[PDB]
């Protein structure tokens, strides 16, 4: 039998959150909208003992031109911003509320290879700090 | 004559909801002078009836508590009744709000028994310590150079930012009394859950070394509490002097019964 | 009975406005022979009036300040009037303009109760110290060597650079008055703000290692104020002596209002 | 002649103590159902004086999906979670009792690439602690 | 929504500081005139609570010849040293104003290697400080 | 003239020491018996002046499935524990006798890439200790 | 405006030092005499406010034959410690003086891989201390 | 004008040293006898002001089967210490006197691949000291 608790799914926290302001999902189809963040996990490590959970996101930004993949990161990048501030709570897919614990910036956006010779894209890495909730 | 195995015995029994604030992201001091009967800030009467509380009656914190605000990037004084209160600003990464009590004992030994027959707490303290970055507000300048923030009326003196000029330190000083407020703040499953403590009287004891550069680091002020002799409260049901109390509430503490 | 939420309340209300020289990349300490009256630097009269200040009325700095200046790579004195005022070079990386403070108490013990009974400050010392590259300044060397700058009747008597021989320490020296400016200047959004302290009277504390090398290090001298008494202030609307004043203006710290 | 104590099997404790819940083995066929675990050995350490074994141990998920791969991987690690905090039993294939000291989670399951197109793949580390039993 | 503070643009920075003096863009397109800079970003971090920023920025110089280069690599080493001296107002391509905290130099401009055989291609690289400004 | 002291042959003492519990040798033939050790040194270091060496030696088991390759690597980890532990004399093949000053184990058995497709490759290392006896 | 200080080129400076005893150039031509030095820079850092350079310098002789190319080795290894040592006045191109605060040797000249089969290609790698001149 | 002081050739030193027992030289022909040993140099530092000079030294050795292989590589360890043991006077090809201050193995024979599927490699590693004497 299982364990009782676990951590909210990051992916999942980090999708519902940035969704309000612009297109993102955990995959890219072969054919979508410009504006677009892609999350990923890389890093992370449990303690059931002390609750403490601390994994690493990163967030890829795709946009048509220089410009607008530069003005994409920006605005994800506040909206990270105002995340760690405030520490809103967040509805996930299935509906549970989750919230943080703290956060802090690694990597600030900056240009990477790609492709397609027209779709520029943009990488920042962020860590989090996160809890353990009952399982429902 | 029956052994239960540890993990239904409740020998492996944890819970991080009872976790302090040892892990948060929101933390926040405030302080602000002491003037006896003014100032008390004793949470409960002769009776027992709550007195005073940093929380309100809904549960959630007061906003009448800070004497300045920040609006639209301009510091403007509160228009509205208040306590009067000031707050610092960031804290430097790695340091923060900490305790550090140093704890004294003597050992009676008798030519009996080496082990020590008897031992006692001698000397007793609990300073704490803050780094403030924010050090051009007035308020942080006037508590580094040893003013008072207010008058002996109890008015403020404190003035806005960028308004006073340069502060001076004067060649004799004399001790004031202040007061300090330590939050933290901890939100789990959308609920807030809150740890505060108080203190009645504290003394500035140390300061710290400040340096000029690229990566210079800013000073941090140490303080030592005091008993004043105004700090009452319901000790086991038993009106008696206190020198430190905690307060503990919020929506999320009340839901763990 | 209502509580805020702490967002909206203020307790997480932060401005990186406030900070001071704690992360800058412009530093400068001047430095001169004090004399008494002819050398008093007290920013305020017994009225309240402004008497003396680094910054100009305008609010830009002064240029009148310095003694010698540096014009197409040629070392020439100031044929302007001047106050008269030496500025120091470069400083080695990690290390500047930096004051240590050093507190000391006393508490009064009761057997009564194990908390101490009352406390106050014993001794109390504001150091500062700074490195210098160029040593080979006329200043500096003087400084170093504990020699006077100018003479009784207060002409200058430092040389320019590459004029005069080899220095000389005097078997017996005696104590020197000296004069110190410690410059933060920090810009932001093109506007200026500037934190200059003053110290009345400082004296020659202790020297530093230095060695001889490939990757020698120069020395590190400090210095220690002390009470002169020729340096008053309006401490709040009150006529006392000090110790050290802070000068704190500029186009950016005037437009926080 | 052989010495007389060694540790238990790592690989043969980890696939019987997860069978029950998700199929695994130590290697996959070309064809079986989604739900999968691997197991593997990457580093350790034996000290016959002190009795004192620490293996290092993988476990990569495969399912069909991101979403069944994402499931699969938290409940292996819930369940991995239950060994290491209540200290169970687990028989061996050769009918043996094994136990273990201590456990610790060192990489929370991540996204790694897979040549099948279809099939998400999983991974997760962890570490272990065990002792030497006698060798019947 | 999004926070209200944001450190100013960097490339854009970079760009506007040194156009004055030689041709500057982010990207280089397949034909233009010898004289040329190019900027980047490779790393950073970003804390809201202290308003601190620590960028990193390279410069690239391509030139025809290998004195041509090494004369631009020059010139633009001490335009960057001038900035770092006298700490200048720089306007933005928006107009707003912009200033540095510190500087610092990591790597003098040395050889690389480039696919084009007659232009010589010279890399610096950087480090800067910057704060946070109000968003308009 | 050469030196007169030595330290005995590690890779000789290894195949002397492993050859009465399966067949091991320092290179493997295209074909042979499917139980296999194979001994290789990879570091090392000799003091002349205080007798000191400390060799560095791998073995690799092959056999024919998983099955029997981590048994013959069990087989082989207690044979080698069991020299730890005893200090035996081996006899060599010049039958000269030689014996350690102590053993340690750095990477118990663990699996490791193959050509073969059905021959299954395991791995351990071992560090030893050896002194120097007369040259004869 | 341009800053009014720069140190001198390093690799103007160690070509017109290393010309009189033997054929040397930033880049090697197609065909020419065997003997021959090339330099290059690898890194280095300049300090504005402390007059500090600290540049890495690379020396690469080409010659026929092993032992042509260790007697030119030979031949730069002793022309450089006599400019290490006795702190020479060298003219530029340009006809400025500059001369060195110290110097260090750090990779002794070795041998290392070339296309060619003939010419046998030693590297040796120095370190120099530099000081800021007036820009004329 | 050179200086006047220099160390010895170390390559030149170890051949001279070890042709005596072995055939030895710094590059081997397409053919020659097996018994074979290879000297190369690959790191070092010198300074003027103390007179000091540490190279490292490898010695290659080529043998027809791994029995050869082997005893070539133990001869050859055995002359090196004997070497490092009684200091003795070696004779250059120019006729110089050369000497050593200390020595020190840093890695003892290891088998190493090769092209050849005959010819067995083993590769040793030495640490030398040596001073300055007189350039005549």
């Given at each position: 039998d299982l364990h009782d608790q676990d951590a909210p799914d990051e992916?999942?926290?980090?999708?519902?959150?940035?969704?309000?302001?612009?297109?993102?999902?955990?995959?890219?189809?072969?054919?979508?909208?410009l504006p677009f963040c892609e999350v990923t996990r890389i890093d992370g490590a449990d303690d059931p003992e002390a609750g403490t959970?601390?994994?690493?996101?990163?967030?890829?930004?795709y946009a048509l031109g220089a410009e607008a993949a530069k003005a994409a990161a920006k605005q994800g990048h506040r909206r990270m911003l105002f995340l760690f501030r405030n520490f809103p709570t967040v509805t996930l897919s299935?509906?549970?509320?989750?919230?943080?614990?703290?956060?802090?910036?690694?990597?600030?956006?900056?240009?990477?290879?790609?492709?397609?010779?027209?779709?520029?894209?943009?990488?920042?890495?962020?860590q989090l700090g996160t809890s353990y909730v009952a399982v429902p | 004559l029956t052994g239960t195995t540890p993990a239904a015995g409740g020998y492996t029994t944890v819970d991080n909801r009872?976790?302090?604030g040892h892990r948060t992201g929101l933390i926040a001091v405030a302080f602000r002078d002491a003037l006896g009967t003014s100032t008390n800030i004793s949470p409960h009467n002769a009776n027992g009836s709550v007195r005073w509380s940093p929380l309100a009656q809904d549960g959630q914190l007061r906003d009448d508590l800070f004497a300045h605000?920040?609006?639209?990037?301009v510091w403007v004084e509160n228009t509205n009744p208040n306590e009067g209160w000031y707050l610092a600003g960031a804290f430097g990464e790695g340091n923060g709000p900490s305790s550090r009590p140093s704890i004294d004992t003597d050992d009676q030994?008798?030519?009996?028994?080496?082990?020590?027959?008897?031992?006692?707490?001698?000397?007793?303290?609990?300073?704490f310590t803050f780094q403030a970055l924010q050090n051009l507000y007035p308020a942080i300048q006037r508590l580094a150079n040893n003013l008072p923030l207010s008058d002996a009326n109890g008015n403020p003196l404190?003035?806005?930012?960028?308004?006073?000029?340069?502060?001076?330190?004067?060649?004799?000083?004399?001790?004031?009394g202040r007061q300090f407020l330590l939050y933290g703040i901890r939100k789990k499953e959308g609920r807030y859950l809150y740890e505060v403590d108080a203190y009645d009287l504290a003394y500035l004891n140390n300061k710290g070394e400040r340096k000029f550069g690229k990566r210079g680091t800013a000073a941090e002020l140490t303080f030592k509490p005091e008993p004043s002799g105004y700090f009452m409260a319901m000790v086991d049901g038993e009106y008696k002097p206190i020198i430190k109390h905690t307060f503990i509430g919020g929506p999320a503490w009340d839901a763990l019964a």
């Open positions: 992916e999942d926290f980090v999708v519902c959150w940035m969704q309000p302001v612009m297109r993102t999902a955990v995959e890219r189809d072969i054919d979508a909208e959970d601390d994994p690493v996101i990163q967030l890829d930004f299935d509906g549970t509320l989750a919230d943080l614990d703290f956060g802090e910036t690694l990597i600030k956006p900056s240009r990477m290879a790609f492709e397609h010779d027209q779709i520029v894209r943009y990488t920042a890495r962020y | 009872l976790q302090g605000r920040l609006e639209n990037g030994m008798i030519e009996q028994s080496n082990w020590p027959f008897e031992s006692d707490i001698t000397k007793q303290d609990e300073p404190v003035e806005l930012p960028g308004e006073a000029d340069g502060f001076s330190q004067p060649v004799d000083a004399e001790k004031i």
